[PDB]
């Protein structure tokens with residue numbers, strides 16, 4: 111429920127939706143941001 | 154073992170595999186990490 115957890119959950123939703131039909135195979139900006147957040151939250 | 158510890162640990166291993174240019178290991182570990190992330194947040 112913390113803000114970092116919320117931001118990770120938000121990004122994950124954006125990644126999955128961006129990989130749905132008719133959209134993308136790559137989500138580089140999102141993955142870069144998720145990677146950064148993972149290091150912030152998983153201490 | 155906590156899921157949070159599993160996620161922290163596997164991210165270290167991903168970094169190490171990347172640093173060693175072990176691209177198949179990176180791919181495999183990243184897929185496992187993605188599954189773990191879902192387990193953690195969906196629990």
Ligand SMILES: [Zn+2]
Nearest residue numbers: 122126187191
């Ligand atoms: Zn996901």
Ligand SMILES: [Zn+2]
Nearest residue numbers: 145149164168
């Ligand atoms: Zn990392």
